[PDB]
Amino acid sequence: DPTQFEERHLKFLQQLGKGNFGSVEMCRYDPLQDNTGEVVAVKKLQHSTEEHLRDFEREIEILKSLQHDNIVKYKGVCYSRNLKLIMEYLPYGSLRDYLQKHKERIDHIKLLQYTSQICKGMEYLGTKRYIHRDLATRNILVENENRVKIGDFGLTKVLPQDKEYYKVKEPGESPIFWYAPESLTESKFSVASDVWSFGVVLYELFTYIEKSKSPPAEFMRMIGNDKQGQMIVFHLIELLKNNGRLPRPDGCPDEIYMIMTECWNNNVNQRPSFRDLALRVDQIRDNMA
């Protein structure tokens, strides 16, 4: 049974990233002990407390239920009752790191390949009634020059059967610079708040991840760098409610700026669908090709 991985055969190779309650490591699954076994990504909990183990086991079922070209591939689990999630290893790292390293050597046509792929993983995700909540280029991974995948689901929620939003009553980690207004004010997440975050990803891509231009740097400038802690969220809400928005990235095509701004609509119902976004991005790619 290949989806059962023995703990004692997973050899630590390298640390890949950490956040909040988890980390991901590159490991070799080497049960022949001759360094020839498969290299894999392993997610585990940093503080494997009871409540986090239950959240993480639901995160694992989330990922196992997803099969899509632009979602990272589940391989299995490792039981010791601590839990390691086993995934394919994607060797070009996170899209945030990748773009920052190759920056303009990646051209507009390539950025839109990535954008289309991202959009299509999200659209698929939404057909299972999952809300990602953390869509940002740091959570997208690069398989090779032609393929990116959504690569972490640690904040992902499942919508209630009878509701189109999930309200998070005691928020933990919150990437508030990527959040829709309603998510800031009422902690409500929906496909439409994922679409809002996707306009932020498009922004990230077209700024080539220039740090002085990142969403946190730009929003902090607009509300004033003196704002701190919970005042950031107060002033960010006021800013967004008054149409303050991230700027058009330098050299961004018009049609691409129009899409970000349409994803950043205050009116939830006026944000585009991921299905229409993929249609539109692939049209733009076609026009450019």
Ligand SMILES: Cc1ccc(Cl)cc1-n1cc(-c2ncnn3cccc23)cc1C(N)=O
């Ligand atoms: C995206 C992400 C979010 C949270 C955590 Cl703890 C790790 C990651 N992560 C996952 C990876 C990763 N790299 C390569 N293959 N792979 C498969 C699944 C996750 C990965 C890299 C990182 C990272 N933080 O840089």
